[PDB]
Design a protein around this nucleic acid. Structure first.
Ligand SMILES: [Fe+2]
Length: 872
DNA sequence: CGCGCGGGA
DNA sequence: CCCGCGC
């Protein structure tokens, strides 16, 4: 975020061009440019980007999300003067309070109202109880009294709450998540009246949003229930309509939920006081809200002076009236427990699957249980973020290891002189040069061997934020504290400043976007500054300074005393390691499994990043797109377990060996890897990993470049390997880590292990001469699949998934033989809906395959941070 | 292999 | 919209 500027995020369905005019008027008076953007998935994108000290200066969203944001410290406490607070309705300030602190400015107010057809019904009923009689007369005329969305509890809640239902009890400025108000007498009476309407055929259990909107907008029903977002569509229709206060129930007002569109200030913003004056003196004025409202209407508004103007529209007045009779939507993440439980209960009470009593009793206990587990998971997550490696570090152990490392450096130097140079396999290694292209030979049917540097340039120097560690003492410090044990005397360790690492990450993404999501001239310019480490074994540690960010070390953790004073007040984590695997039995096994899975047709071909490149995938996916998928694997894997006439599990044995052999090679150098696996894979997720690894998906590419990118929904560390087939020369195709300032050509069997959702990376396009093929493959954790599979396991039994898969393949085929392609798709669609409903139930019970950040919905940015402190 | 159909969202 | 699937 740039100081001296203001960037605003607001959803695309709002008047952003009108807001831009307020910023343009702001830029005139003070010289501060205001940029309004409307990113997609704004509710998801803001907590992900704000948690890293980045993102907008101001966020516009429904107030209910902002308590979640405040729990994570993403929002600044706003400080309106008492005079300014008087300009806005009191209840709107209540909607933007967390922990007794104001955390946002209210802007607009929305709630459900009663919408009625003036020709069908000149005087709409003041009470719910009149509606059955009124419906009887309208039925005689070929109409109905009322249709509205019964599928979503947002729409049915006003009736359920009228006589006493509530979500979470509010007291002393806090929501008590132990106190859910779904099971009291008022809620029961509300839901009962609703189902009595259905039972007496006044309403249909099937009516959803689309059916009710189409019915009201065509003149078929006299009333609906909807919010101000629905008025535009009625305004194109022929219906003469009004908007009024919801009916009462037992003489009590219906209590719709109230959503307050609010502007909050990013905690990481350097422009807090500028954002405050823009919001107070420019937006929250009559002129300000007008400019927005003219673009797209705000509805009702929190600013009293402008709301008195808007309320001349009876639809606005009704909106604010129902809002003031309503229930401010609770601003805590545990509302998700509430929504799922009440949605289920209303659907079951309406269909007859449960009585009202049974439906609400289960919703009460299930929402409270789910809300509780949500808290337990959120506190458990802080423990995994702050967890420490088994302690092997000590001053005594540091020194012993330094001496061993120092001995090995002399051995390596001796056999370097004896041999005439440095080699990785048969490839001559010279750090003075950058390997722009290189030759491979294939003398026998084993893997092709890197033999000769062809094109080169002088090797660029390390960027300023990356420094090679010279000291065996420092090397031993980091090796013991970080769980890294590279080839003694034949590796280089680097320290990378965390702040500069983050900036360089941003510069790299900027370049890729400026190039048109491709390796173009901006990416090439970065590449020309990358230092080649081809043939080397290296590890990069990032050092985070103690806040006197992308990375979240716990500076309350145990501290070691570094040999190097410059580590003091810093925490280190492992962001990347490059290994060179000597060819032998393990590379034989790995290469053979890739060949077996290719020959047997077990790779699913897919395209990534649009059409950036082609990737083949295998492993324990769950492609929910495939309606009949109900077990681990791509569709080819599901089929092979049934159609094989030899051994149904053969490919699962092949995949486990493939994952475990790669894992084993890596674990020998990187002892933190099994600790990471043990820390983040749940008991419920373990059966859906490939063997005893943190890998569930394996990719495979063939002579493919990949644009620079961050992965997002993968694990904390990713493994990538390469191996070659046939002879030839490869130009380009480097793996590039531009935020670390390095790149390399893969040789006989190079592996990189790195933090793929945190370190930008990609692969340059290549040109080949001869038959040479460079095979690349990622082993990674794609946590969506393991979560959905862990959820399916809890619903049906882990071992029952193969039987379900078998049956579902069998009856999709039967439909295709009997009634053709269209019937088969109908059966698969029914299977998907059954599957979906099973997954949601288990997801609602907090069944999980991996531990995840509740705020970001992603895995931690790093693990196993070690704090260093050198007191004098 | 291309393009439709599809789920989740 | 997208490191699927099938005619
Ligand atoms: Fe990647």
């Amino acid at each position: 975020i740039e100081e001296g500027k203001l960037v605003i995020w607001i959803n695309g369905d709002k008047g952003y061009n009108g807001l831009a005019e307020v910023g343009k008027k702001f830029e005139k008076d003070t010289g501060i440019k205001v940029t309004v953007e409307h990113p997609d998935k704004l509710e998801e994108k803001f907590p992900q980007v704000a948690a890293t000290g980045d993102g907008p200066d101001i966020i516009f969203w429904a107030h209910d999300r902002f308590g979640g944001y405040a729990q994570s410290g993403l929002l600044a406490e706003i400080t309106p003067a008492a005079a300014f607070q008087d300009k806005l309705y009191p209840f709107t300030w209540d909607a933007v309070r967390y922990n007794g602190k104001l955390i946002a400015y209210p802007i607009a107010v929305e709630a459900l109202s009663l919408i009625y057809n003036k020709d069908l019904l000149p005087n709409p009923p003041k009470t719910w109880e009149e509606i059955p009689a009124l419906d009887k007369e309208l039925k005689a005329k070929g109409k109905s009294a009322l249709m509205f969305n019964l599928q979503e509890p947002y729409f049915t809640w006003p009736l359920i709450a009228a006589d006493g239902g509530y979500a979470f009890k509010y007291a002393a400025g806090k929501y008590d998540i132990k106190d859910v108000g779904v099971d009291n007498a008022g809620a029961k009476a509300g839901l009962t009246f609703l189902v009595d309407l259905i039972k007496n055929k006044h309403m249909n259990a099937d009516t959803d949003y689309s059916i009710a909107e189409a019915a009201f907008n065509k003149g078929e029903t006299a009333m609906t229930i909807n919010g101000p977002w629905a008025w535009s569509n009625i305004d194109t229709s022929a219906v003469n309509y009004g908007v009024t206060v919801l009916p009462t129930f037992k003489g009590q007002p219906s209590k719709p939920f109230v959503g307050v569109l609010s502007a909050g200030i990013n905690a990481a913003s350097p422009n807090k006081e500028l954002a405050k004056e823009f919001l107070e003196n420019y937006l929250l004025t009559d002129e300000g809200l007008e400019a927005v409202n003219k673009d797209k209407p705000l509805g009702a508004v929190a600013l009293k002076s402008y709301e008195e103007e808007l309320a001349k529209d009876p639809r606005i007045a009704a909106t604010m009236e129902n809002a003031q009779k309503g229930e401010i939507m609770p601003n805590i993440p545990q509302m998700s427990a509430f929504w799922y439980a009440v949605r289920t209960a209303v659907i079951n009470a309406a269909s007859g699957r449960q009585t009202v009593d049974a439906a609400l009793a289960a919703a009460q206990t299930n929402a409270a249980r789910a809300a509780a587990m949500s808290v337990a998971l959120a506190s458990e997550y802080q423990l995994v973020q702050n967890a420490q490696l088994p302690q092997r570090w000590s001053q005594s152990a540091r020194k012993s290891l330094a001496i061993l490392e120092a001995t090995a450096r002399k051995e390596a130097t001796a056999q370097m002189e004896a041999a005439g140079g440095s080699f990785c396999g048969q490839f001559p290694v010279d750090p003075a040069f950058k390997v722009l292209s290189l030759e491979y030979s294939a003398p026998n049917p084993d893997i092709a061997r890197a033999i000769r540097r062809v094109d080169s340039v002088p090797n660029p120097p390390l960027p300023s934020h990356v420094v090679a560690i010279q000291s065996t003492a420092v090397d031993a410090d980091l090796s013991l504290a970080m769980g890294v044990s590279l080839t003694p005397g034949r590796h280089t360790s680097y320290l990378v400043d965390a702040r500069a690492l983050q900036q360089s990450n941003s510069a790299a993404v900027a370049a890729r976007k400026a190039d048109g999501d491709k390796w173009g001239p901006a990416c090439d310019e970065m590449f020309r500054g990358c230092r080649c480490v081809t043939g080397q074994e290296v590890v990069f540690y990032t050092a985070v300074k103690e806040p006197a960010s992308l990375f979240k070390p716990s500076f309350d953790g145990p501290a070691f005393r570094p040999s190097w004073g410059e580590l003091s007040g810093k925490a280190t984590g492992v962001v990347a390691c490059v290994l060179q695997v000597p060819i032998g039995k393990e590379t034989d096994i790995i290469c053979a499994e890739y060949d077996n899975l290719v020959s047997k047709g077990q790779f699913a071909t897919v395209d990534r990043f649009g059409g950036d490149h082609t990737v083949n995938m295998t492993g324990n996916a769950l492609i929910q797109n495939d309606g009949k998928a109900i077990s681990k694997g791509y569709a080819v894997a599901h089929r092979a377990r049934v159609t094989s006439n030899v051994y149904g599990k053969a490919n699962d044995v092949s995949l486990q060996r493939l994952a475990e052999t790669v894992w084993s090679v890596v674990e020998k150098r990187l002892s933190f890897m099994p600790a990471y696996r043990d820390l983040v894979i749940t008991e419920q997720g373990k059966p859906f990993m490939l063997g005893a690894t943190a890998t569930n998906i394996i990719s495979l590419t063939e002579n493919q470049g990949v644009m620079l990118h961050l992965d997002t929904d993968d694990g904390v560390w990713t493994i990538i390997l390469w191996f070659h087939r046939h002879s030839g020369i490869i130009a380009g195709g480097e793996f590039v880590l531009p935020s670390l300032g390095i790149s390399f050509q893969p040789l006989d069997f190079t592996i990189v292990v790195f933090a793929a959702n945190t370190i930008v990376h990609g692969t340059r396009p290549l040109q080949t001469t001869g038959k040479i093929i460079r095979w690349g493959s990622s082993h990674f954790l794609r946590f969506k699949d393991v979560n959905a599979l862990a959820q399916l396991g809890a619903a049906y039994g882990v071992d029952e998934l193969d039987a379900k898969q078998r049956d579902q393949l069998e009856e999709v085929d039967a439909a295709n033989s009997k009634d053709g392609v269209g019937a088969a798709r109908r059966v698969a669609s029914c299977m998907a809906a059954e599957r979906k409903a099973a997954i949601e139930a288990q997801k609602a019970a907090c069944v999980r395959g991996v531990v995840m950040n509740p705020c970001t919905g992603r895995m931690p940015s790093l693990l196993f941070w070690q704090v260093w402190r050198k007191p004098p």
